[PDB]
């Protein structure tokens, strides 16, 4: 289990953060220019990172220790994981996944269960560092030196056919960190598409 990493590693995973805090809001951005009204659920939740400032009330993770910190801060925190979502059939209107895909046990299976709690109309964000990117490079080739060693990345292409083969369609994509996280000292824009920038968000719709 992958995940477990992030129980082992909370406060560095915190650090980063704080370390890299405009490539955290270049982040928010680029999910915050996706996210649509309703009910939203983020899968993976971790310690709220994404679903605080998003403004996303309910929230899944399989960490006590990470649950425990997103529930001080105020979401709501059922544990589970991506595969076996404690949630009902069609009851949400939109799921997240920032950085989350990459360190499931069964990416399909986690997409499908995504599927199955949205609504008609629904929609999944999914968040990732595009494996085909400056910094998906290096993080790859350097992978075998915390986080990554046994993370899965993906390319935005072989995410959206996996989204596809799961269900999803009309798929729109924006992108940011185009400089390397390290050096900014200001929050990178978003663009429309994918191929420039590091972070890429994905929606899909369930039609
Ligand atoms: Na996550």
Redesign the pocket.
């Given at each position: 289990h992958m995940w477990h990493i992030f129980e082992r590693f909370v406060n560095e995973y915190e650090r980063w953060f704080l370390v890299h805090r405009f490539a955290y809001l270049s982040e928010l951005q680029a999910v915050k220019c996706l996210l649509p009204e309703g009910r939203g659920v983020?899968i993976?939740?971790?310690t709220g990172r994404?679903a605080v400032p998003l403004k996303i009330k309910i929230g899944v993770e399989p960490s006590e220790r990470m649950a425990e910190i997103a529930r001080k801060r105020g979401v709501f925190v059922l544990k589970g994981t991506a595969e076996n979502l404690p949630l009902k059939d069609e009851s949400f209107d939109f799921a997240l996944?920032?950085?989350?895909i990459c360190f499931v046990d069964d990416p399909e299976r986690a997409l499908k269960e995504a599927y199955r709690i949205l609504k008609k109309g629904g929609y999944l964000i999914v968040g990732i560092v595009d494996r085909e990117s400056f910094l998906g490079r290096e993080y790859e080739k350097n992978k075998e030196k915390v986080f990554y060693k046994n993370a899965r990345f993906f390319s935005t292409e072989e995410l959206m056919d996996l989204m596809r083969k799961a269900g999803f369609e009309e798929f729109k994509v924006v992108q940011t960190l185009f400089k390397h996280p390290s050096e900014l000292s200001e929050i990178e824009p978003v663009k429309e598409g994918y191929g420039e920038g590091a972070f890429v968000v994905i929606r899909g719709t369930k039609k």
């Open positions: 983020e993976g939740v971790g994404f996944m920032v950085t989350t």
